[PDB]
Design a protein around this ligand. Sequence first.
Ligand SMILES: Nc1ccn([C@H]2C[C@H](O)[C@@H](COP(=O)(O)OP(=O)(O)OP(=O)(O)O)O2)c(=O)n1
Ligand SMILES: *CC[C@H](OP(*)(=O)O)[C@H](O)COP(=O)(O)O
Ligand SMILES: [Mg+2]
Ligand SMILES: [Mg+2]
Ligand SMILES: [Mg+2]
Ligand SMILES: [Mg+2]
Ligand SMILES: [Mg+2]
Ligand SMILES: [Mg+2]
Length: 321
Amino acid sequence: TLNGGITDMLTELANFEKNVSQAIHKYNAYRKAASVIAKYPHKIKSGAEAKKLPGVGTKIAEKIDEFLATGKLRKLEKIRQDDTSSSINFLTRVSGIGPSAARKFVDEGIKTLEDLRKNEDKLNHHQRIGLKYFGDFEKRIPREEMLQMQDIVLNEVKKVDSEYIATVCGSFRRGAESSGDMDVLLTHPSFTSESTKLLHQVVEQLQKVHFITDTLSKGETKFMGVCQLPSKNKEYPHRRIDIRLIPKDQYYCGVLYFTGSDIFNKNMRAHALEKGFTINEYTIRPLGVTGVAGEPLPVDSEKDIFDYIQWKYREPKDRSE
DNA sequence: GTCGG
DNA sequence: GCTGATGCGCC
DNA sequence: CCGACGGCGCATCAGC
Ligand SMILES: Nc1ccn([C@H]2C[C@H](O)[C@@H](COP(=O)(O)OP(=O)(O)OP(=O)(O)O)O2)c(=O)n1
Ligand SMILES: *CC[C@H](OP(*)(=O)O)[C@H](O)COP(=O)(O)O
Ligand SMILES: [Mg+2]
Ligand SMILES: [Mg+2]
Ligand SMILES: [Mg+2]
Ligand SMILES: [Mg+2]
Ligand SMILES: [Mg+2]
Ligand SMILES: [Mg+2]
């Protein structure tokens, strides 16, 4: 809301750099800038003001001055007017089509949903499912539906083994009134950092009751697929579901990772590296002079990882952009 | 694109 | 098959 | 052409 013009402009630029330029570090720079501006508790009145925030430099300050003066950005007007850029940006919205595949498609004259549907022979299984549920996957999930989904997943997991614990993470755990998809963190006492089909049994039970409808990818620790709520005698949209099986003794690094947000995580890990540590979904470690990280540090809470880095604990609701 | 070694 | 790199993706 | 930028799972491909 506050500074929404500016954060929309920077997000649109980020998406162009990732999807069209294939410049992931410019995507991240624009996202980091939009994130810090979104948290700033004042209406920005100049680029000079904004330049004082970490991750805003000369170039973004100039773009903020243009936007504040005119209510638009000439660079974005030109991007929006380029059919090629617009086609490439559009195809990346398809699950399984990234910047490289999108550019290949558009170079071969595939520029629309109709072109993709006429050229399904050119798509892999992941892209075919992304195409089938394209409209469904653009939609967000109201928290009321996330609650029903939580209730099916937790009930079916308990039926496979009462010792599993399933935790719905991502935007849901941050308290969002709607979610892009469902993220489930799974633990079982039989899988720790010390000893080793725990994920498979859960996926199979959710397929058997027809909640999971399609598989995009599946290994020993990560499931990526599609699910659907049962409906009365209009169907619910198909939804994306992610399931991550994490070592039970690494639950807190796991839940911290899977709660996000994404920008919160990259910011928190970048701030660990400047403070001499490395954080992944499993552990927090101190860095050696040799480049090789040391032994996993003891962790009894999410707060304990904040502490090692000297951060005020943020409740999950305070980890959103 | 920005920051920092 | 491997390693290593890329492409898709997850926060 | 200053390099780093968060860290990693799964699927595939290149070059063995
Ligand atoms: N803040 C910066 C700017 C540049 N460089 C890189 C790119 C430069 O090409 C290189 C050093 O070469 P220069 O001749 O530009 O640096 P000098 O300090 O020698 O230049 P000057 O004569 O302006 O002092 O370091 C860097 O590491 N950090
Ligand atoms: C936003 C302006 C650009 O900053 P970055 O190094 O992406 C450049 O300064 C000018 O590039 P252009 O926007 O392509 O002209
Ligand atoms: Mg880049
Ligand atoms: Mg700054
Ligand atoms: Mg995509
Ligand atoms: Mg591209
Ligand atoms: Mg999510
Ligand atoms: Mg580890």
